[PDB]
Amino acid sequence: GSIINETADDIVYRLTVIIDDRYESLKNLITLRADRLEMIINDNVSTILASI
Amino acid sequence: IINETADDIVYRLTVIIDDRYESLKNLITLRADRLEMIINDNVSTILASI
Amino acid sequence: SIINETADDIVYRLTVIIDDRYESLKNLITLRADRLEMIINDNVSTILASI
Amino acid sequence: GSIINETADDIVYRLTVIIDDRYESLKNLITLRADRLEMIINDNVSTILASI
């Protein structure tokens, strides 16, 4: 009763922290590598146009 | 009770997982769409400049 | 026992949820990466054939 | 601990291994495809610059 649901709420909270923490890390890596690809791309097109 | 509680756990954590998965799915699609639009735009600029 | 049985059930069910969400994101990442690689290599060969 | 405490610990552990693994594979996948794109982009910019 006070144990079954406190152990239910505890499982959910503990796994929610794991899931949230892994998710935010994936969110940051996608944003990081996409931002990085776009600087690389923007720089290279600037270089090509400035070399023509 | 033991089964009602287990169903509650699986359900609640399944809402979390699906929400996180959905936002990542959207993020991947957004950034990939941006990249495809950026690459096409830039190549069209190069082609009109050579 | 009703405790271990229910625990194995929680793990199995949620593992399928996670695997499904994982394999779907794996496929999306591979797909969008594959397209971007093909768009780049197509567009570069187009430039090179035009210069 | 209690049986419910050791059972809840085993649920969280087994699902944390699953979550982490699927996370780690997506981490390596995103890094891999971003690296592949950058290798392609940089080969192609050096080919364009040497061709104009």
Q: Three-class SS string for B9-43?
A: HHHHHHHHHHHHHHHHHHHHHHHHHHHHHHHHHHH
Longest dimension (CA), chain D: 74
Spatial distance between the Cα atoms of D9 and D6, rounded to a whole number of angstroms: 5
| Cα R_g (chain A), whole angstroms | 22
As to burial, measured by CB atoms within 10 angstroms (0-12 exposed, 13-18 middle, 19+ buried), residue D3 is: exposed
Give the neighbours of chain C: at least 3 Cβ pairs within 8 Å: B, D
Q: Structure resolution in Å? A: 2.2
Alpha carbon distances (Å) from C36 to B27, D18, D38: 16, 30, 11
Distance CA D25, CA A8 (A): 29
On whether any CB of chain A is under 8 Å from the CB of D15, the answer is: yes
- Give CA–CA dist B27/D34, Å, rounded: 15
Other CB atoms within 10 Å distance of the CB of residue B46:
20
How far apart CA A34 and CA C29 sit, in angstroms, is: 12
The Cα–Cα gap between D19 and D12 comes to 10
Structural domain span for residue C45: 1-51
Per the structure, how many domains does chain D have? 1
Rounded distance, CA A12 to CA C46, Å?
53
Tokens of B44: 């069209």
Contacts of B37 in chain A (CB under 8 A): none
- For this PDB entry, the determination method is X-ray
Mutation target vs B (from C8, C12, C14, C37; most B CBs, 10 A cutoff): C14
Interface residue B3 vs chain C (CB under 8 A): yes
- Single-letter code of the amino acid located at B48: A
